[PDB]
Structures are given as C-alpha cells and as structure tokens.
C-alpha cells in the first residue's frame, strides 16, 4: 500500500463546494465520491446534483433533505432512480424543493456500494488507496472544527459520534504527523482551500472511519 494518496492529483476530485444553511453535507460527500468513480470509468470529471439527492432521496431512504441524511441511502437512491443528474442540469439552491429528476440530463449511474466496518483506519486507507475517494461522516460539532485553518486537525473533546458529511480523498504524513486529506463542503475559505487533513491513526479520531461507503459504476 502506498504512504500517500491525493486523488486531486488524478483530475478525480472536483472544485469545493458551499453548502451553506442548508444540512446536506451527506449529498455533498455522496457525489464527492461517485463523481471519482465517474472520472474512473469515463475520463469525464462532472459535478453531480446534490440537490438531486436533497429533493429525490427523502423519506422513502431516511432522509431529510436540509435537515440532513445518509450517504449510503442516497447511493441507494441512484441505483433505484437508474440515475443521478449532472449539477450543471440541477443546480444547488440550500433548500428543500420538490423533487425534479429529468433522466435527459442523466450524468453518472450507480451499480452498488460498499460499506467499510466500523473503527478500522486500516481498511479505510485500504480502500482509499484502492479505490478511489470514500464517503465518510465526522463528528464536527466542535469550535474547533469551523475555525480550522491550517495544519494537522486533532481536537481531544472529538467524539466518535458523527453528524457532517465529508469526503476522504487521500492521505499521508506531515512531519511525524499522519493524516488524512478531506474535502469538505464550507467552501475554499474553509482549512486549507476547502479541505482539512485529521489525526489518523489516532483511534478514530472523530469518527472518520466510524461510517465509511464508497459508490461503484460497473460495465
Ligand atoms: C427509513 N430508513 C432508515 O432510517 N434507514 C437507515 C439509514 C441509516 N441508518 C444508520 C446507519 C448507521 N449510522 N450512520 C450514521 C451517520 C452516517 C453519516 C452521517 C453524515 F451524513 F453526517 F455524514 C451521519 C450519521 C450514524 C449511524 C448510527 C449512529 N451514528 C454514529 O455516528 C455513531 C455510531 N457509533 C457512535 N456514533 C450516526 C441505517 C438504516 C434506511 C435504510 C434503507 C431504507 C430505508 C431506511
């Protein structure tokens, strides 16, 4: 296995995201980490609806749309919907709305998903290394967190409860120090132009390997 990965290098990532009022931090790591597959599979890098999954992916999967949600159902969604559409075609407005999927702009498809078991960081880098970026849950309710800027996060009043949904798009070291690279959804204001790199290896450190998933488009 590899010590670092960055799968910003390999054109899979898109631009960072603002999700702002809204709770859909789950939508959000849900298309990071199809969008990868996407890019995999096509050679397209295309930014997929999140308020797709926000409208479309409600009660039936769990969800809430603003009030938040699941990544694991909503990738369930895009297997029963036959369909995701592309951003460009549903645009992101930080409110729920009535549901408007019109498979003409159809963008990226969904074969299955995979769950990770709970608390392995090894399985996760695993994975991450293996397969592309993962969809993982975080606990972000922390001072701490909204004013991160810089450097490796590690907060000791983090918990393994999580409720914000991020996007694990590598890992590595930095001076002594491992991490692992995340996209978030508060803009390229936010940590390092959009992103944060967490503890890893430090017990799952806010639960970033508590509820792990990752997306497949087979054929
Ligand atoms: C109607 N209907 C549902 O209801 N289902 C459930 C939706 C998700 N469930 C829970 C999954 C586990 N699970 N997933 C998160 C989770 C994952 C991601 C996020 C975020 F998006 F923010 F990233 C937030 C929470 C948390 C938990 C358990 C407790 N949690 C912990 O964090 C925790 C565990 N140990 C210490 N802490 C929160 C299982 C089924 C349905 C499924 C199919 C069809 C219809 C369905």
Partial sequence: ?????????????????????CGASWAFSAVGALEAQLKLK???????????????????????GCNGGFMTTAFQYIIDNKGIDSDASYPYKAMDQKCQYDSKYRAAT?????????????????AVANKGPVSVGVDARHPSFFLYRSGV???????????????????????????????????HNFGEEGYIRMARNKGNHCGIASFPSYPEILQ
């Fill in 110 to 126: 969904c074969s299955k998903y995979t769950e990770l078991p709970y608390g392995r960081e090894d399985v996760l880098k695993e």
């Fill in 1 to 21: 296995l590899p010590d670092s990965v960055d799968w910003r290098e390999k054109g899979c990532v898109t631009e960072v995201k603002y999700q702002g009022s």
């Fill in 153 to 187: 996060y590690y907060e000791p009043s983090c918990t393994q409860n999580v409720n914000h949904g991020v996007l694990v798009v590598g890992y590595g070291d930095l001076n002594g120090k491992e991490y692992w690279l995340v996209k978030n959804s508060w803009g």
């Fill in 42 to 64: 096509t050679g397209k890098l295309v930014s997929l609806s999140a308020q797709n999954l926000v409208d479309c992916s409600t009660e039936k999967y769990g969800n809430k």
